[PDB]
Structures are given as structure tokens and as C-alpha cells.
Amino acid sequence: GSHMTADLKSLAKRIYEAYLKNFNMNKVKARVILSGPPFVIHDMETLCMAEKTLVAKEAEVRIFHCCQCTSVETVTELTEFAKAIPGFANLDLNDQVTLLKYGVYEAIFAMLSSVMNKDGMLVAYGNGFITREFLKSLRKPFCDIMEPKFDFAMKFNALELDDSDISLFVAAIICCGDRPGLLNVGHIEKMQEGIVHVLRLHLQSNHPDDIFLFPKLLQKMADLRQLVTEHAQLVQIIKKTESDAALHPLLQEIYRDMY
Amino acid sequence: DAASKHKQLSELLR
Ligand SMILES: CCCCCCCCCCCCCCCC(=O)O
């Protein structure tokens, strides 16, 4: 003879659940694997072996093609994650497109930290480990794609975030009123403020030993925006000057007129 | 129009 309401679960928990539902790889899963058996790619021969029995031109071009495939899978994961962020799918279609366009690579290099240590990174759905040195050994311009992402990750990983923290950080990256060309900038600023408020509160509960963790993560978001600007520059050079380095259409769309 | 400049991303979001 009344009407009681749903609940609801805390927004931080719902974003964390959306992140576990939508991403194949997470920091718990990657750390399990990285501790201990992924096949190590550390030279040309181990690369040909991993390729033969795992992924069915010139070596640098195949590593870059594998880089893109990973990005496309993750872009698709990020799009589904975005749709689970309350308010996101009620935005104009154009604004959703714009938020993802500018945000996916910031989110990709943020989450990439979870599968990287100082020696290398997990690849191929956790089944390979490619060493940082091997990546440095490739010929230009391919020898410098990954190293800046490793440098960001070593310092990001030192913050000791867990998946509950990263899901909100990623959500704040996506729900960003800073992006060029937004029309309903007011609605998106309110959505972002709500996400960032829950992030700030979550970091206080989850990391009470580190009272500057929230300003540290704000800086990391600005570091990520710069990292992506430089990445896209590097990607343009590769496309321009390597005829085998064709770009997947979804990724071209994203880079097209980005920075 | 973002949506038309991003047809595959657009498709992912429908
Ligand atoms: C079995 C061969 C191993 C393939 C090694 C590729 C691992 C790449 C993982 C992340 C790549 C980052 C994305 C850069 C390319 C881009 O989308 O612009």
C-alpha cells in the first residue's frame, strides 16, 4: 500500500561494475598473469614464433598492425563502458562521438599501465609479453611509439591504484567538458563534476594514506592529453611515410582532425 | 557534424 524505491548502488560501485563487465583486461587479471605463462617476445625470432602460433610484411609493420587491432578492440570496450555511465547515453549523439574521439586514447594509455612493468607489457589477451627493450630496438620511427607510454605507466603504477580507482579515472576522462566542439557543454560539465566528485571521495576512502592523490590524478589527466597529442603526431608520420602502415578505419576517424 | 565525420564510432554508439 506504498511505493518504496530501488536502492541504488553507489555511483562509484556502478562504474566499477561497468568497468569489470566491459574490459577484457584489468589490473587484477594482469598482475595475476605477470606474477606467475605468457610467451616472451624479445627478438625477431620469438616474434615470428608468437605470431605463427597466436596471430595465425616487415616486422615493425606487423607490430604496428597488432598495436592498432588492440586499440580497436579497446575502443569498442570503451564505447560500451561509456554507455554505462549515467547520463552518457542521454547526450546528443554528436557529443557522445566527440567525447569518445578525444577520450579513448587517454583512457587506453591510462589502462595500458595495468599490463606494463619496467621490463615489458602483456599483449594478445594476456598470452604474450613483449619486452620494452625489443620495442626500443625497432627501426625508426617505430622505436619510440611505446617508450613514452612506459614512462607514463611506471609513474602511474607507482600511485598503486586498483581497478575501483581506474574505472572512475577513466570515467572522468570520458565525461569531459574540455573537449573541442561540444555543443551541450553545460550538461557535460555537470556530468563531469559529478564523476569527479565521486572520484575525489573514492580516493579519500580508498587511499587515505595519500592525501594528494586527487591532485596527482588531475595532473595525470593533463599528462595523458599531452601524451595523446604527441602519439597522434607520431602516428601521422608513420601513416604518411610508411606505405605498409595502413590505418584501421575506426582509428583514422578518431585521429582525423583530432590535434 | 561529429556523427557524420565518425561513421564507425557512430555505429558503435547507436
Ligand atoms: C604477437 C605480436 C605482438 C604484438 C605487439 C603489439 C602490442 C600493442 C599493445 C598496445 C599498442 C598501443 C596502440 C598504438 C597504436 C594506435 O592505436 O595508434
Author numbering:
A (entry chain A): 196 to 231, 237 to 256, 266 to 468
B (entry chain B): 682 to 695
In the authors' words:
Peroxisome proliferator-activated receptors (PPARs), composed of the α/δ/γ subtypes, are ligand-activated nuclear receptors/transcription factors that sense endogenous fatty acids or therapeutic drugs to regulate lipid/glucose metabolism and oxidative stress. PPAR forms a multiprotein complex with a retinoid X receptor and corepressor complex in an unliganded/inactive state, and ligand binding induces the replacement of the corepressor complex with the coactivator complex to initiate the transcription of various genes, including the metabolic and antioxidant ones. All four coactivator peptides contain the consensus LXXLL motifs that interact with the activation function-2 (AF-2) helix 12 upon ligand activation, whereas the two corepressor peptides contain the consensus LXXXIXXXL motifs; we investigated their positions in the cocrystals. The same applied to the interaction of PPARγ-LBD and the SRC1 coactivator or the NCoR2 corepressor. These structural findings support the idea that the agonist-induced formation of the AF-2 helix 12 induces the dissociation of the corepressors and the association of the coactivators.
We have succeeded in obtaining 14 PPARα/γ-LBDs–SRC1 coactivator peptide cocrystals and aimed to obtain more with the other coactivators: CBP, TRAP220, and PGC1α. By employing crushed powders of PPARα-LBD-iFA cocrystals as crystal cores, we obtained PPARα-LBD–iFA–CBP and PPARα-LBD–iFA–PGC1α cocrystals and revealed their structures (respectively). The iFAs bound to the same loci that were previously reported in a PPARα-LBD–iFA–SRC1 cocrystal. In PPARα-LBD, the α-helical LXXLL motifs in the four coactivators were located near the AF-2 helix 12 that was formed upon ligand binding, whereas the IXXXL portion of the consensus LXXXIXXXL motif in the NCoR2 coactivator was located in a position that interfered with helix 12 if present. In summary, the coactivator preference of PPARα-LBD was presumed to be CBP >> PGC1α = SRC1 > TRAP220. PPAR coactivators demonstrate varying intrinsic biological activities, including some enzymes, such as histone acetylases (e.g., CBP) and ATPases, responsible for chromatin remodeling, and proteins functioning in between the NRs and the transcription initiation machinery, such as TRAP220, PGC1α, and SRC1.
